[PDB]
């Protein structure tokens, strides 16, 4: 479906470790085919670059 978003800048982090410029964009992708296929959900209310994980630490 067509899903598009006003230009709010408030970065968030998906479970794919990609930073989205706002929640609207992340939620568009949560519902996309690419999103469902990766069980995409939000993991942080900030850019991913503020987080680390067990792979890169």
User: What is the C-alpha to C-alpha distance for residues 57 and 5, in angstroms, rounded to an integer?
Assistant: 34
Question: What's the structural domain count of the chain?
Answer: 1
Q: Using an 8 Å Cβ cutoff, are 32 and 41 in contact?
A: no
Resolution in A: 1.4
User: What is the C-alpha to C-alpha distance for residues 27 and 22, in angstroms, rounded to an integer?
Assistant: 9
| SS3 category, 57 | coil
| CATH code for position 29 | 3.30.60.30
44: part of which helix (H) or strand (E)? Answer: strand 42-44
Which residues make beta-bridge pairs with 13?
19, 44
The parent domain of residue 20 ranges over 1-57
């Amino acid at each position: 479906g067509v899903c598009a978003c006003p230009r709010i800048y408030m970065p968030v982090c998906g479970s794919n470790l990609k930073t989205y410029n706002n929640d609207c964009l992340l939620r568009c992708e949560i519902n996309s085919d690419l999103g469902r296929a990766n069980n995409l959900r939000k993991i942080a209310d900030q850019a991913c670059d503020n987080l680390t994980d067990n792979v890169n630490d």
